[PDB]
């Protein structure tokens, strides 16, 4: 077990890590094992004086607060986004750009960004007058909740991984993490992208030059959003598993809607689904525009990511056997 797990974890710096195999091999602890590997590799325990027992205790706690029964928004997704961010952070164009604290912020934000996800959308929560939507005034409901939980868990026994940061570091990290996780609200996508394009238009290189907090945080926001929307850029055997999981989750929401006598939301009706066509639409309207812009920012570092993305689009287009794609996109990715 241990040797096989270690062998898989050798790919932690690679796009296309076998994250589902890691989940199986670790006894459903992919987030804990991947985070621990990354913190060791980046020397973050030493830099920030994080006790190893504290790190593991926090990670296990965090991982426990992802719902294993939610098909997509679970601990495997969190582990995937962490690992993807870890790879993006090492892209040559960004070499030496970010401080260790910024790195820690991006990785921690990735780890917590979907914690305690119930497997239904912000719009479902709002439309049902849910407790969470009442608590958060309909505004980035889940994302505010993920932050609140991810930070609160630091307060459990032997969980405060930031205990040896300075006051200023802790404040800065908290501000960056909030900014990053709030940017994972899918409704902010079009604004984030528009703003990234504008950044790319005026970029300075020596390797990217980022002079101010605003530019740095913008890049980290987009980096983690790209990681969150990275599934179609992965090896096809991985991508297809992510598709199958998100559709299962969506169809479960639709089943809840049906039981409540609600109109079934776009993409959530197992009786009227077009999985392949819907992925093509996702790539054409959302994922390709985003990744083409990231690739411009880090040119030429992300070329292989784009090539894969285009191959995968073709595969889905080729296996096709409306209002829905269009309605889903409008309701999901616009403010
Ligand atoms: C490849 C797995 C995957 C991931 C995502 C990303 C995503 C994550 C979360 C949400 C919000 C929500 N409803 O929970 C919406 C989209 N979207 C999709 C998808 C699936 C069908 C159609 C479209 Cl346009 C997109 N497919
Ligand atoms: Cl795998
Ligand atoms: Mg989310
Ligand atoms: Zn708890
Ligand atoms: Zn996510």
Residue numbers in the entry: 254 to 459, 463 to 577, 593 to 606
Reproduce the article's own wording on this structure.
PDE4D allosteric inhibitors bind in the catalytic site and complete a hydrophobic surface that allows closure of the amphipathic UCR2 regulatory helix in which hydrophobic residues are oriented towards the catalytic site. Closure of UCR2 inhibits the access of cAMP to the catalytic site and consequently enzymatic activity. PDE4 allosteric inhibitors share a common pharmacophore that allows the compound to engage UCR2. A central aromatic core is clamped between a pair of hydrophobic active site residues and donates an electron pair to a hydrogen bond formed with an invariant, active site glutamine. The central core is decorated with a pair of projecting, aromatic arms denoted as Ar1 and Ar2. The key phenylalanine selectivity residue projects from UCR2 into the active site where it makes an edge-to-edge or edge-on π–π interaction with the Ar1 aromatic ring and a face-to-face π stacking interaction with the aromatic Ar2 ring. By contrast, subtype-selective PDE4D allosteric inhibitors are designed to accommodate the phenylalanine while clashing with UCR2 containing a tyrosine (i.e., for the PDE4A, B, and C subtypes) as the tyrosine protrudes more deeply into the active site. X-ray crystallography shows that the binding pose of BPN14770 to PDE4D in the allosteric site highly resembles that of BPN5004 to PDE4D.
The PDE4 enzymes are distinguished from other PDE families by the presence of a pair of upstream regulatory domains known as “upstream conserved regions” (i.e., UCR1 and UCR2). PDE4 enzyme activity is regulated by the opening and closing of UCR2 across the catalytic site, while UCR1 is required for assembly of dimeric forms of the PDE4 enzymes. The absolute amino acid sequence conservation of the PDE4 catalytic site, to which classic enzyme inhibitors bind, across the four PDE4 subtypes has made it difficult to develop subtype-selective inhibitors. However, a single amino acid difference in UCR2, a phenylalanine in PDE4D and a tyrosine in PDE4A, B, and C, has allowed the design of PDE4D subtype-selective allosteric inhibitors.
